[PDB]
Design an enzyme around this catalytic site. Structure first.
Site, PDB file in Angstrom:
ATOM      1  N   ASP A  25       0.838  -1.205   0.000  1.00 34.94           N
ATOM      2  CA  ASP A  25       0.000   0.000   0.000  1.00 34.94           C
ATOM      3  C   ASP A  25       0.872   1.254   0.000  1.00 34.94           C
ATOM      4  O   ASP A  25       1.221   1.782   1.058  1.00 34.94           O
ATOM      5  CB  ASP A  25      -0.935  -0.050   1.217  1.00 34.94           C
ATOM      6  N   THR A  26       1.196   1.753  -1.197  1.00 41.97           N
ATOM      7  CA  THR A  26       2.046   2.933  -1.300  1.00 41.97           C
ATOM      8  C   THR A  26       1.353   4.191  -0.793  1.00 41.97           C
ATOM      9  O   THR A  26       2.030   5.178  -0.496  1.00 41.97           O
ATOM     10  CB  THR A  26       2.502   3.141  -2.745  1.00 41.97           C
ATOM     11  N   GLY A  27       0.028   4.177  -0.681  1.00 46.72           N
ATOM     12  CA  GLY A  27      -0.707   5.293  -0.131  1.00 46.72           C
ATOM     13  C   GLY A  27      -0.772   5.334   1.374  1.00 46.72           C
ATOM     14  O   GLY A  27      -1.419   6.222   1.938  1.00 46.72           O
TER      15      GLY A  27
HETATM   16  C1  YUP Z   1      -6.962   1.065   3.585  1.00 47.18           C
HETATM   17  C2  YUP Z   1      -6.785   0.645   2.125  1.00 47.18           C
HETATM   18  C3  YUP Z   1      -7.210  -0.812   1.891  1.00 47.18           C
HETATM   19  C4  YUP Z   1      -7.585   1.548   1.171  1.00 47.18           C
HETATM   20  N1  YUP Z   1      -7.205   2.975   1.208  1.00 47.18           N
HETATM   21  C5  YUP Z   1      -6.002   3.354   0.440  1.00 47.18           C
HETATM   22  C6  YUP Z   1      -4.807   3.720   1.335  1.00 47.18           C
HETATM   23  O1  YUP Z   1      -3.613   3.817   0.548  1.00 47.18           O
HETATM   24  C7  YUP Z   1      -4.988   4.974   2.213  1.00 47.18           C
HETATM   25  C8  YUP Z   1      -4.929   6.274   1.384  1.00 47.18           C
HETATM   26  C9  YUP Z   1      -5.037   7.507   2.244  1.00 47.18           C
HETATM   27  C10 YUP Z   1      -6.250   7.841   2.847  1.00 47.18           C
HETATM   28  C11 YUP Z   1      -6.312   8.976   3.634  1.00 47.18           C
HETATM   29  F1  YUP Z   1      -7.500   9.286   4.208  1.00 47.18           F
HETATM   30  C12 YUP Z   1      -5.219   9.802   3.856  1.00 47.18           C
HETATM   31  C13 YUP Z   1      -4.030   9.429   3.243  1.00 47.18           C
HETATM   32  F2  YUP Z   1      -2.932  10.198   3.431  1.00 47.18           F
HETATM   33  C14 YUP Z   1      -3.911   8.307   2.446  1.00 47.18           C
HETATM   34  N2  YUP Z   1      -3.968   4.994   3.251  1.00 47.18           N
HETATM   35  C15 YUP Z   1      -4.237   4.877   4.577  1.00 47.18           C
HETATM   36  O2  YUP Z   1      -5.334   4.801   5.091  1.00 47.18           O
HETATM   37  O3  YUP Z   1      -3.058   4.866   5.259  1.00 47.18           O
HETATM   38  C16 YUP Z   1      -3.120   4.963   6.694  1.00 47.18           C
HETATM   39  C17 YUP Z   1      -1.938   4.214   7.288  1.00 47.18           C
HETATM   40  O4  YUP Z   1      -0.825   5.096   7.106  1.00 47.18           O
HETATM   41  C18 YUP Z   1      -1.284   6.449   7.179  1.00 47.18           C
HETATM   42  O5  YUP Z   1      -0.856   7.219   6.084  1.00 47.18           O
HETATM   43  C19 YUP Z   1      -1.968   7.747   5.325  1.00 47.18           C
HETATM   44  C20 YUP Z   1      -3.227   7.526   6.168  1.00 47.18           C
HETATM   45  C21 YUP Z   1      -2.833   6.414   7.144  1.00 47.18           C
HETATM   46  S1  YUP Z   1      -8.486   4.074   1.252  1.00 47.18           S
HETATM   47  O6  YUP Z   1      -7.893   5.403   1.095  1.00 47.18           O
HETATM   48  O7  YUP Z   1      -9.261   3.715   2.431  1.00 47.18           O
HETATM   49  C22 YUP Z   1      -9.454   3.746  -0.224  1.00 47.18           C
HETATM   50  C23 YUP Z   1     -10.605   2.966  -0.131  1.00 47.18           C
HETATM   51  C24 YUP Z   1     -11.339   2.709  -1.282  1.00 47.18           C
HETATM   52  C25 YUP Z   1     -10.924   3.228  -2.517  1.00 47.18           C
HETATM   53  C26 YUP Z   1     -11.707   2.952  -3.781  1.00 47.18           C
HETATM   54  C27 YUP Z   1     -13.211   3.067  -3.536  1.00 47.18           C
HETATM   55  O8  YUP Z   1     -11.322   1.642  -4.217  1.00 47.18           O
HETATM   56  C28 YUP Z   1      -9.768   4.001  -2.587  1.00 47.18           C
HETATM   57  C29 YUP Z   1      -9.024   4.262  -1.446  1.00 47.18           C
END
Ligand code: YUP
Lengths: 99, 99
Positions: A25-27
């Site tokens: 999960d690069t995000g």
């Molecule tokens: C959980 C995963 C399975 C899915 N997600 C991706 C995920 O990469 C997310 C991105 C992110 C969200 C955010 F609010 C702020 C942020 F900076 C980054 N990262 C995240 O939650 O990271 C946590 C842990 O580390 C911290 O750093 C950043 C936050 C903390 S999502 O976003 O729920 C998502 C759901 C459904 C769809 C479509 C419908 O398919 C698209 C995206």
């Protein structure tokens, strides 16, 4: 390896001696796993996602093997919908994005 | 190019004629963008992650250019804290994970 993205980048990890499936999960800044019994001490922490903030258990300096690549870092344990491997560990295994 | 993961993989995108900052997110199936008034028809959807769900508007066949790479697909628009480029568009620009 090289991992294409037409499917979810799911991998097998080893932590606490148990195998589990997790998403690369690069995000994600941090690594967050579903409820599990990990050994050692931990401290309460909060992490925020797309839906808001949750309480998690922060384990530091945890050994975790990702597709045979060893990492030692922080693992957050709590009510995440999916086991996610975040950048704190992806950097340890030398992961980069390329296009 | 190659994008390391020491920091958030933030890139410049162009959508609806606007330039924005967005995360290349291998952990997202689909693309989620900050609230913006796009023309055309849409359908409501609920999407979930850490902390719960948010309501979004699903637009189909939307053009977005990511670092000069053009892509066209579904985008979900709603109150996300960050613009998220998901796998549905990362594949179109030739993005891979490599470690
Ligand atoms: C959980 C995963 C399975 C899915 N997600 C991706 C995920 O990469 C997310 C991105 C992110 C969200 C955010 F609010 C702020 C942020 F900076 C980054 N990262 C995240 O939650 O990271 C946590 C842990 O580390 C911290 O750093 C950043 C936050 C903390 S999502 O976003 O729920 C998502 C759901 C459904 C769809 C479509 C419908 O398919 C698209 C995206």
């Amino acid at each position: 390896p090289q991992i294409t993205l037409w499917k979810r980048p799911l991998v097998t990890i080893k932590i606490g001696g148990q195998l589990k499936e997790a998403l690369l999960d690069t995000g994600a800044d941090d690594t967050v796993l579903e409820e599990m019994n990990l050994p050692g001490r931990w401290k309460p922490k909060m992490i925020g996602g797309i839906g808001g903030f949750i309480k998690v258990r922060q384990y530091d300096q945890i050994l975790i093997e990702i597709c045979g690549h060893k990492a030692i870092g922080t693992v957050l344990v709590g009510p995440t919908p999916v086991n996610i491997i975040g950048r704190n560990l992806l950097t340890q295994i030398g992961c980069t994005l390329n296009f």
